[PDB]
Amino acid sequence: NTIHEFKKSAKTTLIKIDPALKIKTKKVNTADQCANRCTRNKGLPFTCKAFVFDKARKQCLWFPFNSMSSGVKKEFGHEFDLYENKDYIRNCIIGKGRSYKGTVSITKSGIKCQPWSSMIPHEHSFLPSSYRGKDLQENYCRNPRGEEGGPWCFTSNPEVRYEVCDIPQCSEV
């Protein structure tokens, strides 16, 4: 069971703008079954970069793209959960990491990040809805205002309001 290995976005599927792009679907029992096929890439005529489980139609949708790909857009649906293969979510930072979408959720000194949706331990105004496009989801390290320090988070230690996270620059020579 490889499902916990994917970055999950609730109530979301992906749509092609490009009719050219390819999709594979199969009726299935559980979301874990979509995950296994994606991880192993068995019987897909492409590299599985993401999949959707449709909980109403009991279907996997396997994709050679993700939510960051050109010619694809997110779509809302109560029945869908999106799972993006972490191997195709850039895990290094460009510049100050304004566009960082990876899942690192621990600070430089090893403190588990506080969820953006929470006011515990720390009250703050980085509400996800105020910061659209900045992916203030779960407790991921993010740099929503593009400050000098790189991605950071509020910390689950009450004595440390916030700390930078230790995410490498993609290229610095």
- Summarize as ranges the residues that interact with its own copies (CB under 8 A): 2, 4-5, 41, 44-49, 64, 68, 86-92, 94, 99, 102-104, 106-110, 112, 165-166, 168, 170-171, 173
Q: In angstroms, rounded to a whole number, what is the distance separating the alpha carbons of residues 43 and 60?
A: 13
Closer residue to ligand 54O, CB minimum distance, 71 or 146: 146
Return d(Cα 31, Cα 156) in angstroms, integer. Answer: 30
- Among all chains, which residue has been given the structure tokens 């994917």? 6
Q: Can you tell me the distance from the alpha carbon of 145 to that of 105, in angstroms, rounded to the nearest whole number?
A: 18
3-state helix, strand, coil in the chain (%, to 5): 10, 30, 60
The one-letter amino acid code at 121 reads: P
> Phi and psi dihedrals of 5, rounded to 5?
-80, -10
Query: Distance between CA atoms of 113 and 14, rounded to whole angstroms?
Result: 28
Q: Using CB under 6 A, which of 15, 147, 169, 170 touches ligand 54O?
A: 147
**Of the two residues 77 and 103, which places its CB atom closer to its own copies in the complex?**
103
Q: Would you say 36 or 77 has its CB closer to its own copies? A: 36
Name which of residues 101 to 130 contact ligand 54O (CB under 6 A). 124
3-state secondary structure of 87: helix
Q: How many residues bind ligand 54O (CB under 6 A)?
A: 5
Rounded to whole angstroms, the Cα distance separating 7 from 87 reads: 10
- Contact pick of 161, 168, 169, 170 for ligand 54O (by CB under 6 A): 161
Q: Binds 18, which of its own copies, ligand 54O, none (CB < 5 to 8 A, cut-off by type)?
A: none
Restricted to residues 24-53, the positions that interact with ligand 54O (CB under 6 A) are none
124 binds, among its own copies, ligand 54O, none (CB under 5 to 8 A by kind): ligand 54O
Find the largest Cα–Cα distance for the chain. 52
CB closer to ligand 54O out of 84 and 163: 163
Residues that bind ligand 54O (CB under 6 A): 124, 147, 152, 161-162
